[PDB]
Structure 1
């Protein structure tokens, strides 16, 4: 019961750090997609 309490505490912490890491990757990708689409539109118009 102590070991499970321990391991799950650490797992929940690892999950937290992964959520942050993934959310950052998500948002960089989110911004990059918008920027890339716009650059293709601008290039076609010019």
Structure 2
């Protein structure tokens, strides 16, 4: 049982690490999209204020 438990924990934590990495892929893509959106939005606000005056 000890050998089986340790093998199972190895497999389970390997699967958990792979799930976490596969989630970080999507989260990083979303983070980059949102960062660019924030930059564009702030810039458009600045230039729309500048034009309005």
**Bucket of the pairwise TM-score, normalised by the shorter protein:** 0.7 to 0.9
Residue 17 (structure 1) shift:
0.7
TM-score by length of 1: 0.83
TM-score by length of 2: 0.74
Misfit runs of 4+, over 6 Å: none
Structure 2: unaligned runs, 5 residues or longer: 1-5
Bigger Rg, which one: 2
CA RMSD in angstroms, aligned pairs only: 1.4
Spell out, residue by residue over 1:1-41, the C-alpha distance to the aligned partner (whole angstroms, 9 max, x if none). 11101111100101111111111111011100100001101
Q: How many residues align?
A: 46
